[PDB]
Amino acid sequence: MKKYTCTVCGYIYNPEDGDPDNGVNPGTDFKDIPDDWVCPLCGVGKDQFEEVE
Template identity: 35%
Template sequence: MPTMFEGSYLGDGSRISDGARLECGICWHVYDPAEGDEVWQIPPGTPFSALPEHWSCPNCDAPRHKFMVVDAL
């Protein structure tokens, strides 16, 4: 299991709200559910917890567990 760090959602999607924005801990790319992800063809309104398991940062390819919650709307 990957090492988790403070600020991460600890791999548990139920710990984050549907409107939460998360930031990549590697390149600082922000996933905003209101915008979705054009690179991965994720439609707007898709919460981070509903992203496919194989999804990774569209900017640097970091895995999901490297993302930290920045806004818990």
């Protein structure tokens, strides 16, 4: 599974770690994160994220 980066602040979503404190369990692919989730550091929406190739 691929990492994704917040293109506003630089935060990296790592699927192995998830974002458990906001309800995103380890092993969740980015696409499957609920679409109302926001960057945990800066607060912007998922549409500001991009895949890290």
